[PDB]
Amino acid sequence: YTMSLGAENSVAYSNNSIAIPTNFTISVTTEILPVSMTKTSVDCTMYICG
Amino acid sequence: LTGTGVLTESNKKFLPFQQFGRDIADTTDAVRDPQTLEILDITPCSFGGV
Ligand SMILES: *[C@@H]1O[C@H](CO)[C@@H](O[C@@H]2O[C@H](CO)[C@@H](O)[C@H](O)[C@H]2NC(C)=O)[C@H](O)[C@H]1NC(C)=O
Numbered sequence: 001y002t003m004s005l006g007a008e009n010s011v012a013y014s015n016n017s018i019a020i021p022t023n024f025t026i027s028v029t030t031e032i033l034p035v036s037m038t039k040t041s042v043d044c045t046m047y048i049c050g
Numbered sequence: 051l052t053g054t055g056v057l058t059e060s061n062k063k064f065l066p067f068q069q070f071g072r073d074i075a076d077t078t079d080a081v082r083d084p085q086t087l088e089i090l091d092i093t094p095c096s097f098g099g100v
């Protein structure tokens with residue numbers, strides 16, 4: 001299929017109307033970030049020649 | 051098949067036709083002794099950085 005970007009949401013804009021929140025949600029989200037790699041050492045003489 | 055390694059007793063039960071043993075990286079880590087029908091693990095000789 002041809003992918004859809006997102007659901008369409010036409011915001012009801014007018015020159016004298018505002019939307020004010022009456023409530024709130026305390027939302028906890030996860031962010032995973034790599035920090036380090038495996039520290040690998042290669043003996044060049046032993047690798048090439050044994 | 052020549053090489054240099056420590057030959058220890060093995061817990062791998064070989065099939066009667068198989069003689070050699072390889073790990074993931076295609077290196078021979080197990081062998082069957084031709085004189086006595088027993089299985090030996092080859093651990094590589096101790097090495098490390100100084
Ligand atoms: C604020 O008012 C606007 C206009 O009356 C609302 O917008 C309409 O909402 C209905 C409800 O589903 C939709 O069917 C219409 O298509 C919307 N019109 C437009 C131009 O967007 C809006 O929902 C109201 N907001 C609140 C929080 O009550």
Ligand SMILES: *[C@@H]1O[C@H](CO)[C@@H](O[C@@H]2O[C@H](CO)[C@@H](O)[C@H](O)[C@H]2NC(C)=O)[C@H](O)[C@H]1NC(C)=O
Binds near residue numbers: 022023024
């Ligand atoms: C704001 O939203 C919260 C939801 O997070 C509402 O809390 C709920 O209230 C109902 C009715 O009192 C309870 O049955 C739910 O168990 C409540 N949820 C939680 C998570 O406590 C709160 O009442 C809303 N406030 C307003 C003014 O709309």
